Amino acid sequence: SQIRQNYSTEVEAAVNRLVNLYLRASYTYLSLGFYFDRDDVALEGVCHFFWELAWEKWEGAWRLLKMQNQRGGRALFQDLQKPSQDEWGTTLDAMKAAIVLEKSLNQALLDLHALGSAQADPHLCDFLESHFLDEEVKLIKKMGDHLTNIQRLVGSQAGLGEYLFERLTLKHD
Amino acid sequence: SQIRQNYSTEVEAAVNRLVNLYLRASYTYLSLGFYFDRDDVALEGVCHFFWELAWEKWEGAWRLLKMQNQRGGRALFQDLQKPSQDEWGTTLDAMKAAIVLEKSLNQALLDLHALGSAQADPHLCDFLESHFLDEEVKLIKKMGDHLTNIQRLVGSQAGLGEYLFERLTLKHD
Amino acid sequence: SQIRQNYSTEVEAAVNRLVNLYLRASYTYLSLGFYFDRDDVALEGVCHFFWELAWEKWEGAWRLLKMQNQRGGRALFQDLQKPSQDEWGTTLDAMKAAIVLEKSLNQALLDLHALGSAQADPHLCDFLESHFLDEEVKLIKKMGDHLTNIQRLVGSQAGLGEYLFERLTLKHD
């Protein structure tokens, strides 16, 4: 490569693996959003929350691929596994699955940052810090906030709580 | 007729029958809206939902009659039966009655489309596809969404749920 | 299902298969665009052409999934295979691969339309006609136009022709 400089094969491969994880996550969120759009589920704010994340994770994959080419590495795509479930249960089940997913993406980001630091690759480390690490902390905190509000609304009237959360916390129209 | 071309007597008669079904449906929705406007029912958003449908079905009848004349057929009006009930129960009872009504209109549209296809009447088939079939699918999906949200709000506090649905899902002011 | 009407299991399954084909096509176009963004390929207009198609096919999948729920069918996601190549050759090779891909999507659309017609499902047939069939004919014609212009530019100076096509036909900035 005419441009490649200080860009390890190990980082290049790890970035391709992270692209796969982000595209998997995008696909998971597409499925989550369409489940909440079912006529027998019908939680518009929950659907929009997950569709926005489907877009956000697709965009994250695109930013990683752009950076891979900026560094002179080679994008290599692998098959994308389907999401872990076909039906996602309640809003609570779905938000628990989402925070498990985000903690897995966050650990992959942290592992790649540690590899970049071991390889003395400061551009990689800055790239993750600037575009991914804080967005992940902010999203995980938001999902934690939502889990707490969903949990306080269960009481002995789960349907009422699930409606109210969707109506009064999540964005709809 | 100086204009009539490729317009069967069978289609002409079926369009007149469909006009009757749409005017019946308009009348049903007028009754539903006035029931929810009673001082002892008093669900403004439910009343407005059904009054909008009373208008929409009157408009559908007018569009069918306009098309009948565009094709050179003859509008023939029949008596309009009163709605099936004088009192419509809860919002849930009313939305169940509405989706039964809309599935009956949808089946009549589908039957007329099948007659038009058998008669090789593409203008009729396009007319229904362009003005009626998707509006019916979209409305039935919306009513299904509403039925699911109404059902989740019943719990053991039916009055509370019925208020909240009207306040937080249906349009009022 | 509380809403499902005139929606066959055969159509429901075929729509899920078509979603998979559109998401595969989106993924193919993501790969095509990133190949042309390589520092050793560097054809900005070619990259933008394929990235726009990656978005367009993702959007097509979303519209099919929205329609599946509008009809009361159930979205079912399957694994997504990786694209057929890791490296896409010249602009000519890539545009030939794209028109093969689009003819495969077009045949799948035509097969689903024929199934809908056999099942007397006019909403399905109108949906494909209104959102997919003309967009596919227009795109395939555009790709044919581009293939002809690329082919006339090869001459005995392939590099010069490939540059000029990207500069003077495809959109860049």
Next chain:
Amino acid sequence: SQIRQNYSTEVEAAVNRLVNLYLRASYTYLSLGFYFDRDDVALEGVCHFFWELAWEKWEGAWRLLKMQNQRGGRALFQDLQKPSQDEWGTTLDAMKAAIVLEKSLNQALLDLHALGSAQADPHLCDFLESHFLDEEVKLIKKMGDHLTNIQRLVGSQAGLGEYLFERLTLKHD
């Protein structure tokens, strides 16, 4: 020094050396731009590309000197060697010389970042990451893109290709 804190003599000296390298690079780009402004070379877009880089590297030197004073180190200027050539050959020769120059600046940035990390100087490390490392990766990728387009335009008509690149890729007016 009344302000100096956590700022090693090693970093201070390395920053002064990097200032010299940036001012050398600015001077190289001044020479490159004036060569392409010759009446017997006459490639306006090539001249403007290199004059913009002459400004950019002067600005980089100024930012390093500002940071040196912010940290309480002392700017020390050394003689500036003349550029490596008086005549720069073709656009291809010149862009090859430019990417060699930029990889040398990038390695100096990476070496200073590694020194800062060894000295536990996070302000220095953040400063380079925020103002220099990504600007260098982006510029080197751009030069790689340009080298690929210049190389594809050589064919057996080098003059024609050199004109077309300057006219259709580089900014002029």
